[PDB]
Design a protein around this motif. Structure first.
Motif, PDB file in Angstrom:
ATOM      1  N   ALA A 215       0.845  -1.186   0.000  1.00  0.00           N
ATOM      2  CA  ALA A 215       0.000   0.000   0.000  1.00  0.00           C
ATOM      3  C   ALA A 215       0.883   1.240   0.000  1.00  0.00           C
ATOM      4  O   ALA A 215       2.115   1.153   0.000  1.00  0.00           O
ATOM      5  CB  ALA A 215      -0.951   0.007   1.202  1.00  0.00           C
ATOM      6  N   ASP A 216       0.239   2.404   0.015  1.00  0.00           N
ATOM      7  CA  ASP A 216       0.967   3.661   0.086  1.00  0.00           C
ATOM      8  C   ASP A 216       1.547   3.848   1.487  1.00  0.00           C
ATOM      9  O   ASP A 216       1.383   3.009   2.380  1.00  0.00           O
ATOM     10  CB  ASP A 216       0.057   4.828  -0.303  1.00  0.00           C
ATOM     11  CG  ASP A 216      -0.979   5.163   0.763  1.00  0.00           C
ATOM     12  OD1 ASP A 216      -1.269   4.315   1.629  1.00  0.00           O
ATOM     13  OD2 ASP A 216      -1.514   6.290   0.725  1.00  0.00           O
ATOM     14  N   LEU A 217       2.238   4.973   1.683  1.00  0.00           N
ATOM     15  CA  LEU A 217       2.802   5.260   2.998  1.00  0.00           C
ATOM     16  C   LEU A 217       1.705   5.486   4.028  1.00  0.00           C
ATOM     17  O   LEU A 217       1.803   5.002   5.160  1.00  0.00           O
ATOM     18  CB  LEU A 217       3.731   6.470   2.925  1.00  0.00           C
ATOM     19  CG  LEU A 217       4.617   6.710   4.150  1.00  0.00           C
ATOM     20  CD1 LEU A 217       5.002   5.403   4.807  1.00  0.00           C
ATOM     21  CD2 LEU A 217       5.866   7.476   3.766  1.00  0.00           C
TER      22      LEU A 217
ATOM     23  N   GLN B 146       9.463   9.403 -12.162  1.00  0.00           N
ATOM     24  CA  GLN B 146       8.829   8.152 -11.756  1.00  0.00           C
ATOM     25  C   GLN B 146       9.698   6.930 -12.021  1.00  0.00           C
ATOM     26  O   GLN B 146       9.867   6.089 -11.132  1.00  0.00           O
ATOM     27  CB  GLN B 146       7.483   7.996 -12.473  1.00  0.00           C
ATOM     28  CG  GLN B 146       6.641   9.257 -12.453  1.00  0.00           C
ATOM     29  CD  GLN B 146       6.305   9.711 -11.048  1.00  0.00           C
ATOM     30  OE1 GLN B 146       6.464  10.882 -10.710  1.00  0.00           O
ATOM     31  NE2 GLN B 146       5.829   8.786 -10.224  1.00  0.00           N
ATOM     32  N   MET B 149      13.152   6.552  -9.686  1.00  0.00           N
ATOM     33  CA  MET B 149      13.065   6.107  -8.297  1.00  0.00           C
ATOM     34  C   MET B 149      12.699   4.635  -8.169  1.00  0.00           C
ATOM     35  O   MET B 149      12.909   4.052  -7.100  1.00  0.00           O
ATOM     36  CB  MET B 149      12.052   6.942  -7.511  1.00  0.00           C
ATOM     37  CG  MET B 149      10.755   7.252  -8.235  1.00  0.00           C
ATOM     38  SD  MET B 149       9.452   7.704  -7.066  1.00  0.00           S
ATOM     39  CE  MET B 149       8.277   8.519  -8.144  1.00  0.00           C
ATOM     40  N   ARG B 150      12.159   4.022  -9.219  1.00  0.00           N
ATOM     41  CA  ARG B 150      11.789   2.614  -9.161  1.00  0.00           C
ATOM     42  C   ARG B 150      12.930   1.677  -9.540  1.00  0.00           C
ATOM     43  O   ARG B 150      12.788   0.461  -9.374  1.00  0.00           O
ATOM     44  CB  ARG B 150      10.577   2.354 -10.063  1.00  0.00           C
ATOM     45  CG  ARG B 150       9.275   2.913  -9.496  1.00  0.00           C
ATOM     46  CD  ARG B 150       8.191   3.016 -10.555  1.00  0.00           C
ATOM     47  NE  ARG B 150       6.881   3.288  -9.975  1.00  0.00           N
ATOM     48  CZ  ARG B 150       6.376   4.501  -9.793  1.00  0.00           C
ATOM     49  NH1 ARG B 150       7.051   5.589 -10.129  1.00  0.00           N
ATOM     50  NH2 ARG B 150       5.161   4.627  -9.264  1.00  0.00           N
ATOM     51  N   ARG B 217       4.750  -4.727 -11.247  1.00  0.00           N
ATOM     52  CA  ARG B 217       5.410  -3.632 -10.546  1.00  0.00           C
ATOM     53  C   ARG B 217       4.419  -2.571 -10.091  1.00  0.00           C
ATOM     54  O   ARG B 217       4.760  -1.747  -9.235  1.00  0.00           O
ATOM     55  CB  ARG B 217       6.453  -2.982 -11.455  1.00  0.00           C
ATOM     56  CG  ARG B 217       5.812  -2.327 -12.669  1.00  0.00           C
ATOM     57  CD  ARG B 217       6.767  -1.483 -13.481  1.00  0.00           C
ATOM     58  NE  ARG B 217       6.069  -0.859 -14.599  1.00  0.00           N
ATOM     59  CZ  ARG B 217       6.645  -0.102 -15.521  1.00  0.00           C
ATOM     60  NH1 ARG B 217       7.948   0.131 -15.513  1.00  0.00           N
ATOM     61  NH2 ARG B 217       5.894   0.435 -16.480  1.00  0.00           N
ATOM     62  N   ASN B 218       3.210  -2.568 -10.652  1.00  0.00           N
ATOM     63  CA  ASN B 218       2.202  -1.553 -10.386  1.00  0.00           C
ATOM     64  C   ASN B 218       1.015  -2.110  -9.608  1.00  0.00           C
ATOM     65  O   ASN B 218      -0.121  -1.669  -9.800  1.00  0.00           O
ATOM     66  CB  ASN B 218       1.719  -0.929 -11.694  1.00  0.00           C
ATOM     67  CG  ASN B 218       2.722   0.032 -12.281  1.00  0.00           C
ATOM     68  OD1 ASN B 218       3.840   0.155 -11.786  1.00  0.00           O
ATOM     69  ND2 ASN B 218       2.321   0.737 -13.333  1.00  0.00           N
TER      70      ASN B 218
ATOM     71  N   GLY C 215       4.478  10.498  -5.891  1.00  0.00           N
ATOM     72  CA  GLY C 215       4.483   9.484  -6.931  1.00  0.00           C
ATOM     73  C   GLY C 215       4.968   8.123  -6.489  1.00  0.00           C
ATOM     74  O   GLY C 215       4.646   7.126  -7.139  1.00  0.00           O
ATOM     75  N   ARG C 216       5.718   8.055  -5.388  1.00  0.00           N
ATOM     76  CA  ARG C 216       6.226   6.784  -4.881  1.00  0.00           C
ATOM     77  C   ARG C 216       5.141   5.906  -4.276  1.00  0.00           C
ATOM     78  O   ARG C 216       5.442   4.785  -3.853  1.00  0.00           O
ATOM     79  CB  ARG C 216       7.299   7.032  -3.830  1.00  0.00           C
ATOM     80  CG  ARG C 216       6.926   8.149  -2.883  1.00  0.00           C
ATOM     81  CD  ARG C 216       7.562   7.988  -1.522  1.00  0.00           C
ATOM     82  NE  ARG C 216       6.879   8.794  -0.520  1.00  0.00           N
ATOM     83  CZ  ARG C 216       7.245   8.863   0.751  1.00  0.00           C
ATOM     84  NH1 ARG C 216       8.274   8.171   1.212  1.00  0.00           N
ATOM     85  NH2 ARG C 216       6.566   9.655   1.579  1.00  0.00           N
ATOM     86  N   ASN C 217       3.909   6.392  -4.189  1.00  0.00           N
ATOM     87  CA  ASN C 217       2.833   5.660  -3.541  1.00  0.00           C
ATOM     88  C   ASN C 217       1.767   5.176  -4.510  1.00  0.00           C
ATOM     89  O   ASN C 217       0.832   4.488  -4.088  1.00  0.00           O
ATOM     90  CB  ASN C 217       2.192   6.534  -2.457  1.00  0.00           C
ATOM     91  CG  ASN C 217       3.115   6.762  -1.284  1.00  0.00           C
ATOM     92  OD1 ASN C 217       3.595   5.811  -0.664  1.00  0.00           O
ATOM     93  ND2 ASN C 217       3.381   8.025  -0.980  1.00  0.00           N
ATOM     94  N   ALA C 218       1.873   5.514  -5.785  1.00  0.00           N
ATOM     95  CA  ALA C 218       0.894   5.122  -6.785  1.00  0.00           C
ATOM     96  C   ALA C 218       1.575   4.300  -7.878  1.00  0.00           C
ATOM     97  O   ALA C 218       2.796   4.122  -7.888  1.00  0.00           O
ATOM     98  CB  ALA C 218       0.196   6.354  -7.370  1.00  0.00           C
ATOM     99  N   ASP C 219       0.763   3.794  -8.801  1.00  0.00           N
ATOM    100  CA  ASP C 219       1.287   3.057  -9.937  1.00  0.00           C
ATOM    101  C   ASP C 219       2.035   4.002 -10.877  1.00  0.00           C
ATOM    102  O   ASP C 219       2.036   5.227 -10.703  1.00  0.00           O
ATOM    103  CB  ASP C 219       0.159   2.350 -10.685  1.00  0.00           C
ATOM    104  CG  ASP C 219      -0.942   3.301 -11.110  1.00  0.00           C
ATOM    105  OD1 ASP C 219      -1.879   3.525 -10.316  1.00  0.00           O
ATOM    106  OD2 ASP C 219      -0.866   3.831 -12.237  1.00  0.00           O
ATOM    107  N   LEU C 220       2.687   3.416 -11.885  1.00  0.00           N
ATOM    108  CA  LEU C 220       3.460   4.221 -12.826  1.00  0.00           C
ATOM    109  C   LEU C 220       2.564   5.192 -13.585  1.00  0.00           C
ATOM    110  O   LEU C 220       2.890   6.376 -13.721  1.00  0.00           O
ATOM    111  CB  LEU C 220       4.214   3.316 -13.799  1.00  0.00           C
ATOM    112  CG  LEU C 220       5.139   4.023 -14.796  1.00  0.00           C
ATOM    113  CD1 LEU C 220       6.603   3.841 -14.414  1.00  0.00           C
ATOM    114  CD2 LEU C 220       4.881   3.547 -16.220  1.00  0.00           C
ATOM    115  N   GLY C 223       1.610   7.930 -11.406  1.00  0.00           N
ATOM    116  CA  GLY C 223       2.804   8.707 -11.124  1.00  0.00           C
ATOM    117  C   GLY C 223       3.189   9.613 -12.275  1.00  0.00           C
ATOM    118  O   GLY C 223       3.666  10.732 -12.067  1.00  0.00           O
TER     119      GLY C 223
END
Lengths: 242, 243, 242
Positions: A215-217, B146, B149-150, B217-218, C215-220, C223
């Motif tokens: 999940a998210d933060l 995006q 960072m991945r 990944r998503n 953006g680190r908390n959602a899908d690409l 994001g």
């Protein structure tokens, strides 16, 4: 098909007993029953997962192919593999995957399902299922991408190459690399250190960690604050806070 | 404008080359559009098994940082400048066959973003990468915020974008920006050598892990595990598994 | 409890220290609430371009995990975590980049404060850990989540479960700290780095921050929706042209 040996008394070692080969749908269902009894067991605190013998934690990437079946039987075979991997991942106690050699294919997937991987220097890991016309089936395509990254995951699944243990610490597949003659001792010392830690602090840390990753933060912080609360209604917090 | 060569064991490996060494293989609007057509808009032909992407000239992969300062028009149109970069980075990312990004020298701005869209990045010892977009006044608008960072994490990505510096190849492998680093003279063979290894393996089992990886990944673990079980059964419906 | 100096080229780098030298810069409810005021709850003044967070005394960034003066009232810590989840939310979501020049001890509450920063530059004496489990509880201010999203699930589990204490040499080996620099050259290295971001475009860097932090908390795909929205805004802003 296995052994269970507990000693402290709070730690057992689970040893995959099939040295003649490797994880079929028969030694996997056994792995489900062994890890369900440790879930309800209160007198073990961490779990050491290793292979019987001295040359393979598991080599299930060249030496077991029931793969002469229809496509529908593949779903059931994979479902068994997902369940055993899920069981050994979400078990109450932390899991230490002692890699005493070959850990390939399903063996790597089972080891990757564990929390901490300490490998011998004489250990080999990878996902060679692409050399037989299939993707990883027991959890390689997702777990591998989460421990080492999307970059090194694609390299190891597309090529399917086998890698030494040293380059696995480099890419983070294993956490520590230790001599084969010193693998059992170093895994036990880490197990004793975790065992001396508070059970509820560690076990509820695992729940917040094994779930906060998905999940998210903000939602993950909700599990942590719920983890924060539960360990507080426990005398372990107050007794050790002296 | 761009070059493609299809040559391998029974012609399985394709080497796609950006052709603009005069301006350090920069990526303008046309280079994006022309490249998208080369990857055939998220598919390819059966003959190709592995794709190799690398800027022509051996000097740079794509140094579109200092040589394309064309952003002087209509912030309305800036949406379609990022959308075009978004499309080109998705097409390379979601192409059917694995892409080996053999960086050869400079990879900055959109060039670094083009490399990050690929699956595997093998670096030359003379390569330098980075996202210097912030020095101009903009973030990396082609997926650089995006994608970066991945592949390397939150600490290194944030450090790279904020300062907007250039990292040498050995520090790109240290943080994971490039899978491998090899001498520039021996680059194209080593990039090739991995391609025939991937192509030697069963093709369908390769591109089905890719679908389960690029889409897993998503999503959470449970959803990603359900995608793997579908491609795994997909791979049992074909003779490659049995043979 | 605080000290706020602001001087630089273009006069935009604000040095923020934890002021508690006698207690190894320990983290209580009094210093936690000020750092939130110090960061003005997800904003700043327009003069400051870069924020540097370190500890007073050049011997402990914040050894606030080993201030154990909260052993009461499981209800009266929901808020203690809520307090600790609020400094992290304010330090991590501040407009300008956060650079943590950790100087010595930075453990748990101090460590989780460091994980809130974008950049960490440690020293040879800077050593980190999450010993909360040795106390009887999980990390509470974001340790179980921020550590995983920085060093990966494999090393966070090793850190959180054992609650052990690692040096800076292996803290940079796992990505916990971006750079490691001698004990005589932390602030200078933090300053030169902080200068490097300060000399860039102010809207460019902070809108990257919003694009990456959210953006680190959602899908690409989502994001990229973050990035395209922030990207268009910078073009309207004068710094993109000149």
């Amino acid at each position: 098909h296995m052994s269970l040996v507990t000693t402290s008394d709070g730690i057992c070692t689970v040893k995959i007993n099939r040295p003649d080969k490797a994880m079929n749908t028969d030694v996997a269902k056994e792995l489900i029953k062994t890890f369900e009894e440790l879930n309800h067991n209160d007198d073990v605190k961490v779990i050491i997962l290793t292979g019987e013998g001295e040359k393979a934690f598991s080599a299930g990437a060249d030496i077991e192919y029931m793969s002469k079946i229809s496509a529908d039987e593949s779903v059931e075979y994979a479902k068994t593999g997902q369940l055993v991997t899920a069981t050994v991942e979400l078990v109450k106690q932390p899991t230490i995957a002692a890699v005493n050699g070959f850990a390939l294919g399903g063996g790597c997937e089972l080891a990757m399902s564990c929390d901490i991987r300490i490998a011998a220097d004489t250990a080999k890991l990878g996902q060679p299922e692409v050399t037989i016309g299939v993707p990883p089936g027991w959890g390689g395509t997702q777990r591998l991408m989460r421990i080492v990254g999307i970059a090194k995951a694609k390299e190891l699944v597309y090529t399917g190459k086998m890698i030494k243990a040293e380059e696995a610490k480099e890419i983070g597949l294993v956490n520590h690399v230790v001599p084969l003659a010193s693998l059992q001792e170093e895994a036990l010392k880490m197990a004793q250190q975790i065992a001396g830690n508070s059970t509820m602090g560690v076990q509820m840390s695992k729940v917040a960690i094994n779930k906060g990753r998905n999940a998210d933060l903000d939602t993950g912080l909700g599990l942590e604050i719920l983890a924060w609360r539960n360990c507080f209604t426990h005398p372990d917090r107050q007794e050790r806070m002296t």
